[PDB]
Design a protein around this ligand. Sequence first.
Ligand SMILES: NC(N)=Nc1ncc(Cl)c2ccc(S(=O)(=O)N3CCC[C@@H]3C(=O)O)cc12
Length: 257
Amino acid sequence: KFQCGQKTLIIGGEFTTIENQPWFAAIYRRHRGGSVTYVCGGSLMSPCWVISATHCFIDYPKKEDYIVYLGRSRLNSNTQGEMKFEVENLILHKDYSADTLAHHNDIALLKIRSKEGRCAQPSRTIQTICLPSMYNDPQFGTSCEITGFGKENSTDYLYPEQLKMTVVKLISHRECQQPHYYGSEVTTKMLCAADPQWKTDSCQGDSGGPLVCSLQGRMTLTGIVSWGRGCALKDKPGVYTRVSHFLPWIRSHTKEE
Ligand SMILES: NC(N)=Nc1ncc(Cl)c2ccc(S(=O)(=O)N3CCC[C@@H]3C(=O)O)cc12
């Protein structure tokens, strides 16, 4: 059975396997076709719920178009033990908003289900992540994990075939709001996270994926990759949806209603 956050023992710097990030959900879109093409990262919540970012689904809002993979560490080929699902519920945040850079309320939920009507089942390669609880977040300077199939340099037209991960250090809301950084583009419903350093970061294609921090033991879904200016630029960290600010929203949409 599922025990959230525990493994079986990106400009960024590291290729990985899925047992290193076993809650990582890889979200694709059925075409013509087909001709499934990668869309966004995600994270497993409970056996029937994946959480991602709304900006991912905004241009193709049809749930019946989507495919979620769990236990997958390759962009375009299969992984022993990978599990394939369809989306029978796609919920976007109704207060979502963007300008040319920043996304506000950048959070989405997908209720998953397989061709044989099954929810997700635990394994060495598939595992839930823990939610934060109301109000507590990691404090700044905490080193956290980001995982994704995103671009390896911002100018690339190609994406990596092997899942990448990196570590990034949480920046204070107040430092992120400095003119040289983001100013008021960043809100208290977002978290900034960068490298000291500026050599590792999230990028195009990493959207929706996990920002994982360890709180009080548990490995917890603290952030969802959302946006940033360029990739691994100085004074321009990555910006993440603050998942804690949204538990009423998750709970209101996940439990029954
Ligand atoms: N982390 C960081 N630093 N930038 C990005 N973080 C997350 C995401 Cl999802 C993206 C997505 C796109 C880009 S980008 O550089 O491709 N891009 C397109 C929209 C504006 C931005 C840009 O050109 O500055 C950067 C990040």
